Design a protein around this ligand. Structure first.
Ligand SMILES: Nc1ncnc2c1ncn2[C@@H]1O[C@H](COP(=O)(O)OP(=O)(O)OP(=O)(O)O)[C@@H](O)[C@H]1O
Ligand SMILES: [Mg+2]
Lengths: 227, 198
């Protein structure tokens, strides 16, 4: 019943979820928008503070991507769905040219803070199919399923940039679609999210599961808004 | 002008771009200070309080300025003006939504000698025609600048301080009478002498 109410306000439960999610997801990606500045941008289309053009444009894009994710609930994660999310997210940035929007990487990339083996470009499309086919094979989608999906997706790292944000968008989508607790990956001075990721390995996602469990359920925190 | 042309990738060019865009954009309602505009142009960093439209239109004006310099000595056409307009209003809230112009352009290129009088008459007539819904003023000032540059004429930047002299000169003008505008432009300082040191 949470989802219906969320939809019927599309100040509102929707704007709270959007503001919180976008704030943390973008800040993890390096955005310098404060909570007040992001609120002002989302509500009144006014930019304040010091930002790169890319930060401004990508924050604005992230708003549209969030809307798309909510509008496309229950729809299948496909290659084109993911490429369109990426395309919306990096629209009108210094990555739009070169036409890396919205396209899988052609040149090897990396996640720094680690030397873990990222998927080579040629492996992106097949592994992703194997991942998607795996995801929809699950009888019941759980936080554990979503955590494994998240880690594997990030290890694939299909796009040259924006992998973190797109991954967390998809994670939010999966949670919403399966009436699971809404766990919003939050920024913090200690990099608990990143460290939980780095404690993980293929076949071992317990650090991420524990991290997600350590997060509060958004649905309960703002129960006053819907219940 | 040659100095202008080759300090392009590099500076007379950046000084002209910065000053011109500052005044042209401010007249159009931009809230970028001269420092904020400089920071945007040089480091692609946005500071201060601005609407999204202001940010985007300022960035666009940078691109349009570059295009205008690229098209020096090239003939003013309709598609050229439409390209300026499209570039200027790209990614704004203004995005969703002929004969008199042809006549004006041909009239302009028929003159054996281009003068400030010719440019002034062109400017007023362009504003009276008003070919675009928005950005008409900025496009007009871009074109005026182009016309001055192409003919080694004094480079006079319509200034934000100059209002409302510019506006009142425009309101005193009529078809066939452009003397208020000519006197106004004449009252403006020549960019070339101020930055002759460059
Ligand atoms: N040790 C790790 N193991 C697996 N994945 C990781 C690890 N560390 C980070 N990641 C994921 O890789 C993504 C890379 O993005 P990062 O945070 O490094 O900066 P960014 O490139 O600016 O963010 P974005 O990808 O949204 O553009 C992270 O968001 C994270 O989800
Ligand atoms: Mg990035």
């Amino acid at each position: 019943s949470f989802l219906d109410k969320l939809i019927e306000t599309k100040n509102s439960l929707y704007n709270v979820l959007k503001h919180n999610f976008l704030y943390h997801a973008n800040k993890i990606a390096g955005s310098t928008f404060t909570t007040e500045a992001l609120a002002l941008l989302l509500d009144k289309n006014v930019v304040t503070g010091r930002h790169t053009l890319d930060d401004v444009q990508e924050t604005v894009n992230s708003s549209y991507v969030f809307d798309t994710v909510i509008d496309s609930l229950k729809e299948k994660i496909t290659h084109n769905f993911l490429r369109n999310l990426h395309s919306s997210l990096i629209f009108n940035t210094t990555l739009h040219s070169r036409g890396m929007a919205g396209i899988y990487k052609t040149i090897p990339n990396m996640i720094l803070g680690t030397d873990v083996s990222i998927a080579q470009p040629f492996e992106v499309e097949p592994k992703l199919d194997e991942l998607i086919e795996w995801y929809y094979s699950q009888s019941e989608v759980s936080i554990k399923v979503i955590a494994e999906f998240h880690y594997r997706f990030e290890l694939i790292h299909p796009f040259q940039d924006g992998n973190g944000r797109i991954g967390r968008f998809v994670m939010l989508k999966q949670m919403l679609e399966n009436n699971l607790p809404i766990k919003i990956v939050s920024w913090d001075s200690e990099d608990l999210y990143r460290n939980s990721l780095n404690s993980c390995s293929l076949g071992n996602y317990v650090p991420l599961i524990e991290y997600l469990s350590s997060l509060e359920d958004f649905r309960e925190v703002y129960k006053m808004l819907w219940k």
